[PDB]
Design a protein around this ligand. Structure first.
Ligand code: NI
Ligand code: NI
Ligand code: NI
Ligand code: NI
Lengths: 155, 155, 155
């Protein structure tokens, strides 16, 4: 009634946390380092499993800060009571492929990351780190009626 | 209380179905064949009508499989109690227009469809078939308070 | 119980309104004129503040008409009980940058706006006006359980 079952699949997974008694969602962390070049799609593994009860739906959705600063687009996933296992972040680096090159990757804050080893990246590329806040989980009550076909509507 | 009114506008419409007693959503099928080239927007007709009651909101949203595999982006529609009639899938083929050509279209599983008649398509194009699972419907309770203007907030 | 606290930060802000007793959402208006060229991201200020209670989450999401007609993509924001202040519309002009030019901007209805003063714009650019319906607010009950780590799931 007042508890949610959470399972960690690997050592690299972090426990989802509710920062404040007013923060409606739960912070979801990445369990792998992914380099996403322009227009690239990926399903980023969190290595976290949830057992949501019946009559409820989970919303694995993007953070307001990351989505506004970066070209990283997270398609909101619907977490049912039936689907157990590794939760994937449905993501796409929506930055355009302009065929231009740069020597800097960008973090989830759109800031240039200065690495010691010099490499050539395609412009607009992003990098996501381990245990990094990229998405959040939102559980909302869901209404299930048994639908019947009608020729016309009434009240 | 435990029933939803569903209307089929044409012979090409399919009845929305809840596969399992745990599947929180209802599978929504396409009622037309649409070829979407890169960057193209469309409102795909389902020929299905719903009569959602007051205090509830419908969410016509993308499937996890289709949205992760293909460049097809479905903007989640909000189905009110007032709007009756043909439900449209707000979609966009988000694949970039690179001016390149191919002889293969791609299905909702991103697989190459091998057609007998040879044709030239623009690279990144998709095709959606009749009675094909592209989206799903999610009904959630909605809270309506009568808002009042205040100069400062209190409790 | 049946009231929502709404605050207007400036003279350019408009009060969110529920048109009909069946319209599940509240119309959100822009408080500034923004010209968005292809691929450009912005946080459009509404100058409106809300005090959503605990156990509820706000959904600042796009309108069905605007999102289907224009290349303007609004990333749905989650409005918590803790975050008070100016609500920002997380937007991106998803139109491709084809390096082509036109002398017409486009409104939220994708129509060409004919201005007296002749100017050169980049093709696919949009303009948003003051007190213009671009987004809507949807408040949904949110379930908060205290999560506990388990090795395996049970019932
Ligand atoms: Ni959503
Ligand atoms: Ni795009
Ligand atoms: Ni949504
Ligand atoms: Ni949403």
């Amino acid at each position: 009634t007042n508890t949610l079952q959470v399972k960690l699949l690997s050592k690299n997974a972090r426990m989802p946390e509710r920062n404040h008694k007013t923060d409606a969602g739960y912070d979801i962390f990445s369990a792998e380092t992914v380099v996403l070049e322009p227009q690239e799609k990926a399903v980023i593994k969190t290595d976290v499993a949830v057992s949501i009860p019946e009559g409820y739906v989970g919303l694995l959705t993007s953070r307001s800060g990351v989505s506004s600063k970066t070209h990283l687009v997270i398609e909101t996933g619907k977490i049912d009571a039936g689907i157990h296992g590794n939760l994937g972040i449905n993501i796409k680096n929506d930055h355009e492929d302009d065929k231009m090159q740069t020597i800097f990757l960008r973090n989830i804050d759109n800031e240039k990351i200065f690495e010691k080893e010099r490499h050539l990246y395609k412009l607009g590329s992003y990098r996501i780190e381990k245990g990094e806040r990229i998405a959040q989980l939102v559980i909302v009550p869901i209404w299930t009626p048994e639908l019947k076909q009608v020729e016309e509507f009434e009240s």
